[PDB]
Structure formats: structure tokens, C-alpha cells
Amino acid sequence: ASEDKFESVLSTRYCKNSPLVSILSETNKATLWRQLWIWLAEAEKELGLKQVTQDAIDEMKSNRDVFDWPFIRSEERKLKHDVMAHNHAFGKLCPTAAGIIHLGATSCFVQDNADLIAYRDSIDHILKRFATVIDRLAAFSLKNKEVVTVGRTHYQTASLVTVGKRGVLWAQELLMAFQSLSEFRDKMRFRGIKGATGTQDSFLTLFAGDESKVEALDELVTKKANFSNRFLITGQTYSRQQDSQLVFSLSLLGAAAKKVCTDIRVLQAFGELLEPKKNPMKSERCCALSRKLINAPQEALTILADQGLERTLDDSAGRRMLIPDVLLTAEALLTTLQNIFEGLSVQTDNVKKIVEDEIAFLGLEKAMMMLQTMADPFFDSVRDRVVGLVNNPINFTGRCVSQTESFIAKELKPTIDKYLD
Amino acid sequence: ASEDKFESVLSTRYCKNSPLVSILSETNKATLWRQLWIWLAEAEKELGLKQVTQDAIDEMKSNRDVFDWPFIRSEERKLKHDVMAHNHAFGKLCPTAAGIIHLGATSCFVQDNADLIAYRDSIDHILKRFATVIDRLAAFSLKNKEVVTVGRTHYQTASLVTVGKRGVLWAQELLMAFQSLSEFRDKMRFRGIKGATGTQDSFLTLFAGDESKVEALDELVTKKANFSNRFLITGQTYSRQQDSQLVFSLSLLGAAAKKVCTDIRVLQAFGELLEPKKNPMKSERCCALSRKLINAPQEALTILADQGLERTLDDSAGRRMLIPDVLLTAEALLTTLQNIFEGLSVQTDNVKKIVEDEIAFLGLEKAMMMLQTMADPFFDSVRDRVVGLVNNPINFTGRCVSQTESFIAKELKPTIDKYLD
Amino acid sequence: ASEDKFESVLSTRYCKNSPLVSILSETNKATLWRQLWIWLAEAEKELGLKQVTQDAIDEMKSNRDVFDWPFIRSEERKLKHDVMAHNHAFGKLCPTAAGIIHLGATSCFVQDNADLIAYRDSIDHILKRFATVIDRLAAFSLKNKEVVTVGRTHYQTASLVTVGKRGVLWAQELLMAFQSLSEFRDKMRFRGIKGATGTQDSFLTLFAGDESKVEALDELVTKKANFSNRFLITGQTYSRQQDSQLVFSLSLLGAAAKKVCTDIRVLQAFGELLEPKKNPMKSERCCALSRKLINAPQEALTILADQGLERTLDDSAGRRMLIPDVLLTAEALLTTLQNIFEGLSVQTDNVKKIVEDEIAFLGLEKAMMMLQTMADPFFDSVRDRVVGLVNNPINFTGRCVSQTESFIAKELKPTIDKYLD
Amino acid sequence: ASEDKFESVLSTRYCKNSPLVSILSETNKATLWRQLWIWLAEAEKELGLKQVTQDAIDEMKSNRDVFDWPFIRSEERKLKHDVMAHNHAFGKLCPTAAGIIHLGATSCFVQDNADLIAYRDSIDHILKRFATVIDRLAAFSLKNKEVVTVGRTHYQTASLVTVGKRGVLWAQELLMAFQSLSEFRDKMRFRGIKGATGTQDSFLTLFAGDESKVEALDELVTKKANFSNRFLITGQTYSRQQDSQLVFSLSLLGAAAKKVCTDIRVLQAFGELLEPKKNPMKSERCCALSRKLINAPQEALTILADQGLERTLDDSAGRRMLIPDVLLTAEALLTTLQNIFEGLSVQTDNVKKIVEDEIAFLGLEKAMMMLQTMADPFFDSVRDRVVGLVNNPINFTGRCVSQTESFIAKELKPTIDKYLD
């Protein structure tokens, strides 16, 4: 039974229905390794390396998805190198191509580039879910753009705002995180071909000293992998600073989400909101997931700081554990946020009452600045105006309404629209 | 295929042969929940609560290890509460005991206490492995207690030490971490019975207001669970400050191990040591695992800081992901350290040469303080003494030898001996 | 003007009246360096090193507190080594002792040991303030041991507790932090004399090879410095793992305090408490200070992990910035907590009302378990009992009262009493 | 004496000559507060608020830099609010303007906006120093673009590279950090006018309900403060997510710098480089400073996550301590890096020898791939080619040379050139 052994709670519970569970699986990674060896073979052939035949390539393409795990496992045992084992395994499936698989390339060629492909694919799915989450929150905000409630500083009544303005305040936190992850996705650079230390000496020799062919190969493989950007300067691997940026972008989602979810939990305790005695359990799961993403950046940064010269392998086990975990955690977090925003509702009776218990004083503070219970005379020059505000709280909310609408129409939608359907 | 879905690399790779994979499994946790309900039932009966019959208890004890996962899963679906689902499931297996299962107790009774039992058991196994690791390092140190090499500050020659003194320097870092985890294990407090908010009101009513019976029950269950200490004051759960201490103790192992492994990696690069071109891959895996434990404390501390009043559930998902991960990471780290120390060896030819290229100058520095190539006269009062040191480097190492032996005999062994066999 | 240049906000604002500002000053550190050179001189003389005369020692003791900063500054310039500069400066003040100052010792002798003395002294003051803080909270708890209020899970009504039980829940968090810092203080180990790499070779030669004299000197200096424990095994410095423990203990205070202060801020927002519209500004400052201590442990752990072989100086600037900051932050935090607990009060009218709006339902839940508005019949066997609970909420709080008293009398007081007056 | 009290080691030692010490001083902050009140007054007047006279504004502009600290201090005492105290103080200096100072604005108006101005100014200076640092490293790299040395993986010989390629590898890490901080600087958004809760209700009333005037005022003040971007949506303060981005950008500098400095420290230990027995003390200070920036991001992220609703003040003390510290630490780090790169040199004799001891084997590995000591026959088809590589190591470095030049000319210079002179 699967329950008899420790299991990833993210994979088996919080993200069981996410495509990330497939994207980040060993099978998909090994598949990407083969796909990369395929593209490498195709590009080298296209560039004149005759030793790579079309028959060899056809075997590779035909057997890309065929995995003999029992065999692969024994191979990873005889020789303690996964890449070598998989190359050997792929070699036995494609005997004609066996000799040219990974020709001139380093193991890091498939390892690093497969991670980048797996990561970006995962990020693309996260971005679609992210957009939906933000869209749901925008819907909630518009729906409540004119529902008055008390603004709070130190968690205490400070003025009057609208549920919608606050909804947009939360929306902005999430939108800025979205924009960060969105920009990271556009700027992500592919490693391409760089050799074992980054000099490309093996490929150069392979091309009899022609550097333009080495550059063309690097560009060609990058193009096949569907990347617009690639590193030109590297050691054995692409800069781990790129991974820090990846983790940080997701940590922004965590910080933003935790602020939003804690607000909802507090507001629910105040009796103002109700997430889909009713406990805000979804919001609490949201804070737990968010807390994890928030505490991840410093490890990624330390990984970079710990990289020795052209490369030290103290990053492998660390990257293998860290990155897939944050990607999945972010997805589980977004799924939760989506549930919350789809059914989040306002306890209008409680909100109206909270507003009524505070509006007299906010009115008094208002009269004092402009300078019922104000028949002195002394408020004679501001009595009617204040009374009007008290009978129409919405006029006590400054520009909450227009701010809410313009932000959504001119900033939020234009930003996420391209990710929604 | 298991490879087709994301898997915990710790569970499936770095710790596949560890009993922690069984101890931290869902099956073991659910089993502990049942064991706790059993002990609760036994204690309540022993204390006079007649509603708990021996037949009910016998059903429970007989069916403790019988799991109908397909049923349990559907139950966790109809009702979104694992504990309730498992209670229901255990109830169907024991129809006579169904009505008294968890009588007066809260879900946290099994949840919190099962974690504590699972954690301590895991810690006990970690401590046995830890002791073996330290023992191996002590063996290495004794073997090299008189093998001279250069001491280094800023990674550069500063004097002469012995490989063994350095081995004991590393041993102390690990021993202090061991002592921290060892003390934490002895001081760990059980939650026992506390009710949903920590007042024990349900048990009090159950005992018709007799507080001594409530206290006796709390003590009795703690005794059955094999804990010498228990909290008296709590909210719904036992203080998450205890979990911070747990994570911190393991972070000490990480800091210590990373310092040791980085030293070995650097020494191997210098050509002085060789872990079992030879790359220090095991030491690198050690730094990656260590880095993870080092970056965990702040999350545990934040979990405590985030706990609201008697309890907020923003800690569950967080604890479920954090603690089992650090426990497993520590075990994988210790397994690696053990491999390293069992076959770590000294490249005596290289060490001897490094010592020879530096000993002339260390000798010169020595003569200068006491005040061949010193025939001036000027060194006439210290020439023979220095020459003697250069022909016998070991006499240039101060008290390295006695320090190494006394530390091992009087501090290291007495501390770990009780955990070795 | 001092305002014209960046200033430490801790030193100039949050701790301006604390003795830590004097204890952690450069003058006190240099003074400790001189005191250490004095003790070293005395011990070496007591052990037979005739070159150290009583006249030399008298100069040193007489001029220990005389600082010519302008001169010292120019000296720290000509030669880029503070210790050497101060030795030179102290040498000019004591021309007879100039030649034997720091005889056989390394710079780290004064640096590391002065830090330990400064740190422990700072910790002792922190412990006295800590005890007072806990004492104030215990006073508050006893005063409210029978003031009923609602218990909360997910920040929502879950039962009835007493303000005092909650006060003791907070008290325990702080007490466990206190015990950690208190134990660290008792176990703190002195570096003593160890040489530049930890072998004590210089002192050995100084004593003509007699190791017992080296050990006696190490013990003697430790005794003069008033330390019961000292390291026997070290590299150039004492293990930075000790500093991690120091920072972690203070991080426990931060986690505990933040949980307590956040609870108070939330309770004040609920209208249940009032710290000395009233905003909980002191509690907010408490969370900010606490947050800083919580985010410090991982840096200290990384410092240890980064230590290369016998020593790398990448820890100096880091330690100089980190440790004094956490010590001061903890003191500022404790001062704030003290203010809060001395005037914290309960809004009894609001609490009574909150209890009344919830007690009917808690009563209903109570009747359901035991099995006005219960005249069915159906509650006929529990109507009077529940009605009694509703007319006497205190009987609805389980063992809150006895738990509060026994914890304070048997755990809290015995622990802090020795630090209060 | 200043030495008699704890001092900021950054302000008094590591950055004593930096303009950040002036920019981040209390005097400069209070000056910015006054400047902001001045701009607010000017804009409100320009927009029709007649109550603001030109005489009032002239007093303010004339007395902007006049500080009566003794008075200000007593004022900060009578009333426990710095902003109110400074307003009062500025009011006494400008009796005609006293009544309209900060008209309609919140304290956060000067607090938040002054921080943003102080921060950006500090960042601008950091960017100029950063550019110089990168320029120095590029100079070093070009100078050594053809100096061959061994490439290293696991800190061990893996191939041949050029000192310059490695220099450019380091340069890229720093350049990516530079680009991050550079982009953050361009995107930084001003808070502008938003009211106490973000609704701008006070300004709206002040403009008799005309929203365009409120928007114009917000835009006008932003323009006067010299900001191209401003937030439209906020609570009381501008999003603390912006501060997380600020801290993270600087943490990138720390991660990059630590990787670079650790490499230099290791290379110096190998005898390949020498920073300006020679210990790499500057590089060690660099790692200590870098470590601090690396461990800062998570606190900034937690600050955001902890922000309650429109605002909670648990961020003030935290921000006041965190941000100025990282800004100064980054400046001290850059100053150190600059020193290092200006005099960093290669120990050409040692490098040449290290290359010679390894080039035979690298040659053997090379021959094996293409398929003296190779006279078999068996190498007959590759003997001359390999021999040529061994007599000309530079041809063994793949594309190191062209990569180094193109990166510097096409990526590094175009990026930093605008910041150098």
C-alpha cells in the first residue's frame, strides 16, 4: 500500500490533480533528456556532422517515450551516474544511434536544460492558474465596489472604505507577484551547449575549429527547445542566480497571499467575511503554504553563493529538493486561493452594524476637519454635510470606487487577460 | 509506473532503506491514532468510566492494524476531516466500541500525540545513526592522531597540526549537535489530554468534576505512550516552540556537517584527503543536505509566532511538510557522513610534501619567537632545537596529540557510547 | 550634530538607557582586552614565567582604563590590525610591560574571550529584565485567573477560558525561551588560551614542553575571567556553534514574544484588552523587534557552516554586526514587553458581553455531550446543570483556574525567582 | 567619547566616507519631511487652495534646513509622535504657515515618501559604485583574457580556461545583480498623497469633491519629488512588497559577491591569485558582508505578509532597522570589491606550473575523444594535434577568449557605461 511509506503530501494530496505532478516526474525528466539528445543530434546533423545519420535519429525519435525502468534501475546501480545510465539505456533501444548520442555534450546538457524546460512548463501552468485567481478576486472586488465597511489601521477602525477597494488592495499584491513571475518567464535563459566547463572546447574540436558552427549549434538547439534567450557565458551550468530569481518570484506570491489570507482570517473573525461556527480553514491552509514559499529564497541564494568556480555539485540534491517543492507549493496555494475567491462572501448584516457603531465618530472627526448630535451651534456650518455622510456612508469613502474600477480596468485586466482563455 | 508522477526524492532515493520511511508513513500515523484511542479507552476504564467495556477495548486492540484504505478514502471525502473519517472507519471495525472511541478527547489528541511519538521514534533512530557517525570519525581521528599536516587560517598554512586533531575539531562540532538533539529527546513533552482549547472541560464533566481524575488520566495516557514528561499548560495543541527546538537541533547537525564536509572538499582539492580524478561527491551531497537543515529553523520559529490564541490551523500543512522533511534529510545526511568517514583516507605522500614545503618557514618563525640555514651566528642558541623540530614535525604540533586522545576518551565516547550497540 | 549622520536606532533610541550600550561599546571591549592581557600576565607569572615582573603587571592594572583614542586611531591606521594597535598603545602606557604583553598568546585570545565576556554580561542583564517581564505577566495572570472570556480557535469562539489561563499560556512561551537562554548562560564555554591554530604550541615552548603548565594556564585564565567552563578543543577560535546557540535562544524569545504580542493586538482589536481609539503600538513595536530576532538564527548557523578549517575570517564583520544587534534587540523587546504587562488591562464590559453572546450556544454544545431554551423535554436530565453553567460561566472553564495557579507557583516562580531581586 | 557607547560599525567604520551616512541620517530624513510638506503646500496652492499663501511657503523654504534639535527632542517627548513633533517644530519656525503645514495629508505622507526618496538616492550612489566595481572586474578580465589556467569542477582540474573567462563568469553574476537593482530603481513607485487609509477622502473634501484635483495633486507632488511612477492603489502606506524587491535585489549582489569572493579566497589558497603569507582578508570581509545581505530577504517578505488590512505599525521599527542596514552593507561590500579588483593579480609562475602538471592528462583525454608519450602507434592520427595543444595551452581553452570579449563589449559595457562618468 502507498500509505505504508512516506509520501510527498504535495504530490499525493495538495496537487494530485495538477499537471505539475507529471511535468516534474522522473519519467518526464528522462523524456526531456532524450528529447534534448534528439535535438542535439538533429542540429549537429543540420550543421554538417555526417556521423549523425537520419536512421540513428529516427530510432531516437521513435523510442523517445519507451522506458524499461527495471533495466534503467539496474544500470543506475552498476554505474552510479543517472545520465550515463539513461544514455546507455537509450543506446540499447537505438543501437544505430548509440555511438552518437550526446556527441560532444556534457551530462549537464540534458540535466540543466531539462530542468529549465520542466520549470518553465510548470511556470506556464502556474501563470494560467494565477491569472484565474486574480480574475476571481477582481470579480469579487467589482461586485463589492460599493459595499461600505470600516477601514482599519492597527486592526482598528480608522475610516470607511469599500470591501472592493480592499479587494483591489489584495489584488495588487497578487498582481505584482504575477508580474514578477511573468517577467521571469519571459527572461528565462536556456543553457544550450557549453561543454563541461563552459568553454565548448569539445564542440569546437568536433567542428574542426569553426566557432560560428559552435555558436550556430548553441542557437539551433536553443531554438528547437523553444527558448528565445540563452546564456552565452557559463561554467558547467547556467547561473544559479536564475534559480534564485525563480524562487524569489514565487516567494512574492507567498508574501502577498499570506497578507491577503491573514486579512481574510481576521475579517472572518470580526464577522465581516465568510470563506466558502465557520472557520477560515482554506485561508489557514493558504498561510501555511505561503509561509513555506516565503522561507525558501535564502536557500536558493545560498546555493549560488556556495557554487565553487566553474561548478561544485553541492547544488544538485539541493536544487532537486527545493525547486520542485516551491513550484508545487505555489500551485497548491493558487488552487486554494481560487476556491476562496470563488465563494468568498460578505456578511452584510454584520458589516452594516460595524459601520453604524463607528460612523458617528468618523462623522465627528470629519466635522472637526471641515472646521443630530451637532446642534450646538458650532457645527451649523457643517451639520448638514456630515448628516448627509452618515445617511450615505458611501460618500465617506473618498475615491474608493473610482480607484477600484480604474485599477481593475487599466492595470489588472490588461495584465492578466492574455492568460485567461 | 511510480516514475510517471512526482516523488519525494528523500523517501524514494536518499532514505529508501530507512525505517523513517515507515515511521513517517500515513499508515503508521493512523496506527498511532488508533493506539492512542486504545490507551485513552484503557485509562478511562481504569479510572472508573464504566461505559468503556473490555469487549470494546478488545475489538480496538484486535483491529488496530487493519486498514481498509479504499473505504477510508471515500470517508475522508464525504466528510472533510481525516480524524473523523478514521474514527468512523475504526468505528465500523469495532461496532461495540464505536460509541466510546475518543470519548471526551479532541482530534488534536491523536494528531498532536501521534506526531510526537512518530517524531521521537524517528529521533531515536537518528541518534543511533548519529552515534555511529561520530564513532567512525573518532576512529579516523585516532588512526591519524600523529599524522602531521599543515594547520590553516584563511585556508593558508599557519602552523602544523595533526590530521587527528582536525578530525576531533570536526568531531566536536558534530558531538555538540548530537548533545543538543540528545537533550531535546530527553526533555520532549507529551501533550496528553487537554481538550479542544486546553481546559480539559470535557474530561472534567466526564469525571463529574473530579480534577484529580482528569490529572490522573493525563498522567496515565502519558505513561502508556511511554513519555516521562508532558505539558500541563496548553491551548489546543502542545507549544510549537517545542517543534522549533526540534528543527533547530537538526539545523545544528547541518551547520556542523556542512563545515566538516566543506573542509573535506577543500582538503581533497588540496590533495590531502580522499573520500571513499577523484571528486568528493559524497561530501557535496552532504553540503546540499546540510544546507536544507540550516534553512529550516526560521520557518519553525515563524510557525510559533503565527499561532493565534489557543490555536490557528495555519500550522498543519506547514508542520506536515516541514518536520518530516528535516527528520528524513538529517537521516540521509548521517548515512552519507557515515559512508564518508568509513573510507576517508589521507594522501600521505601529498601531505608529507606540503608539510616539507612549509616547515622551513614555520621553523624560522619558531626561532624568532624563542629569541642548516640558521648558521649565522644569531640562531646559535636555538639552531639545534629548530633543526630537531624540522626533522620531527610532530614536535611542532604543540598538544595536538594529547588533546585528540583526551577529547575522545573523556568527552566523545562517554557521550555516544550508550547509543552504540 | 549626531543627527547629521546615520545612527544605530537601537543604541540611540530603543536601548539608550540600557547598560548594554556600555557593555557592547568599543571602550569596554578594549578594556576587556587589557583585562585579559592582565590576567594572562598574572597567570603566567604565577606559573613560573619570571620574565613577567610585578612592576610590569602594576603598570597594566593601573593604566587599564586610560584610553588615548586619537593615538589609538592613528595606530590602527599605520598598522591595519586593531589588536596590534591596542597592544602597541597599551605598551606605550606600560613601557616596563611592553615586551611581555600577550606573551605567547594570539590576538584571538583577547578578541574571542572579550566577546564571550561582553556577551555573557549582556545576557545576565537580559535575564534580569526577562525575569521581571515574566513576573509582570504572572501578576497579570493571577489578577485575572477568574475573569472568564471566550477561548478561540481560528480566532473564533471555541469555548470559555479565563484571561489568566491565556496569560499563563503566553507566560509559558516566554518561560521556555527564558529557560533556553538561562541554560545557555550556564553552559557557555570560555576559549581560554589555545594559540593561533588551537595547538598551544607557543605556550608549550614557553613552558619548556611542560603540558600541565599549559593546561594550568588555560584553567587559571579561565578562572580569573570567572568562567566555570572552557573549551579544550578548538581551532583558532571557540566554536561558532556556540554563537548559533546564543542567537537561537534569543530567537525563541522573539517567536514567543511575537505570538504573545500578536495575540494582544488581535484581542485589543476585538475590544477585550487595552495595552498601556487606542492602538496597540507597544505590541506592534514588540512584533517588529521579535521579527528581527526570528530572522537571525540562519545567519549564525551559516557563519559556522562557512568556517574553513582552523579558521577563516569571514566571520568577524559578520559576528560584529549580528550578535551585538540581537542582544540589543532582545533588550529593547523585553523593555517593551515589561511596559505592556505592567499596564495591560481587561475591558470587562466588552468581555462580559462577548461571553454572553456566545454562552448560550456553548451551553447547547455542552448539553449535547452530557447526552430556559431547553424546555423540551429532552434536556430534562441536563437542563439545570447547563443553566447553572450559564449563570456561572467560570464553571464552564474546566481546569483553567487550577492550571493557572499551579503553573505559576510550581513552574514559573521557581524558575525566575532567583533573577528577581 | 564616542567609543564609550555602542556604535553602528557600518556607519562609523565600513561606510564612514559614504554619502549614505548623510542620506540615511535623521537630519536628512527630517529635511525630506519638510521638503515634502513644502511640495505639498506648493501643489495645493497651484491647484487653487487659497488658504496656502506664498508668504507661508517662503517661510517654509527659507527655514527648511534649520534644526533646533534640543527643542525637537523635548517635543518628541511631550507628544510621542515624531512627525507631529517635527510639524510643531517646523510650525514654530514658520508661524504664518503653521496652520497649513501638511494640510489634508497623513504623517505617512512624509514618512513613506521620505524613505522612498532617501532609499532611491542611496540606490543611485550604490549603482555608481556598482558600475565602477564591474568596470574594474572587466578590466582585470580583459587583461587576463589569454592567461591560461585550469578550469575546476568540485574544485578540481576539469579542463583549461582563461583567468579572463572566469573573470567574466564572476562579472556576469555581479552584472545580473546590477541589472536587477537598476531595473528596481527605474520601476520604483512613489506613494504620493493617499490619506490615512488610502482613500484620499481628506483631500477630496479639501477640493470640494473634485476628484481630478485630488489626482492632479497626487501627480503634481510626485512630479516635484522627481518620480516618474507612483502607486494609485494603497492602504495607508505604499506596498511593502516594493521593499522586499529592494532587499532582494541587494541580496542578489550578496549571493553573487559571496560566490566571487569565495572563489578568490580558494584560488588564493591554491596560490593562483593574490588580492591587494598573504591572506585574502578583503575577500573574507566581502563574504561576511555578502552573507548579511543574503539573510535579509525573508525578513522583508515577512514584513509584507504581516501587514494587517490597510496598515499595522509592526513594520516601522522593522523597516527602520532593516533597509538602511542593507543599503549600507551593500555600499561597504561594493567598496571592498572595488579595492579587490583594482589590485587583484595572478601568480603567473604558480598558474603556469599548475597547468603543466595537468596538461598531459587533459591532452590524453583530448586524444581519446578525437578517436611524446603517444608514440604507440594508436595516436598516430592525433599525436601532432595534441602535442600542438600541449605546447600552446591557449588552444586548449575552446572559446574562452571570444566569449570573454564579446560578453564585455556587447553586454557588460552597454549595461554599465551610463553609470561610469
Swiss-Prot record, chains A, B, C, D:
SUPFAM superfamilies: L-aspartase-like
Pathway: Purine metabolism; AMP biosynthesis via de novo pathway; AMP from IMP: step 2/2; Purine metabolism; IMP biosynthesis via de novo pathway; 5-amino-1-(5-phospho-D-ribosyl)imidazole-4-carboxamide from 5-amino-1-(5-phospho-D-ribosyl)imidazole-4-carboxylate: step 2/2
Annotated residues for binding of substrate: 13-14, 80-82, 106-107, 236, 285, 311, 316, 320
One cellular component (GO) term of this entry: cytosol
InterPro entries membership: AdenyloSucc_lyase_C (IPR019468), Fumarate_lyase_CS (IPR020557), Fumarate_lyase_fam (IPR000362), Fumarate_lyase_N (IPR022761), L-Aspartase-like (IPR008948)
Gene3D superfamilies, A to Z: 1.10.275.60, Fumarase/aspartase (C-terminal domain) (1.10.40.30), Fumarase/aspartase (Central domain) (1.20.200.10)
Keyword match Amino-acid biosynthesis: no
Role, per record: Catalyzes two non-sequential steps in de novo AMP synthesis: converts (S)-2-(5-amino-1-(5-phospho-D-ribosyl)imidazole-4-carboxamido)succinate (SAICAR) to fumarate plus 5-amino-1-(5-phospho-D-ribosyl)imidazole-4-carboxamide, and thereby also contributes to de novo IMP synthesis, and converts succinyladenosine monophosphate (SAMP) to AMP and fumarate.
Lineage of producing organism: Eukaryota, Metazoa, Ecdysozoa, Nematoda, Chromadorea
Family: Belongs to the lyase 1 family. Adenylosuccinate lyase subfamily.
Identification of the protein by name: Adenylosuccinate lyase
Active-site residues per Swiss-Prot or TrEMBL entry: 154 (proton donor/acceptor)
Molecular function, one GO term: N6-(1,2-dicarboxyethyl)AMP AMP-lyase (fumarate-forming) activity
Subunit details: Homotetramer. Residues from neighboring subunits contribute catalytic and substrate-binding residues to each active site.
A GO biological-process term: 'de novo' AMP biosynthetic process
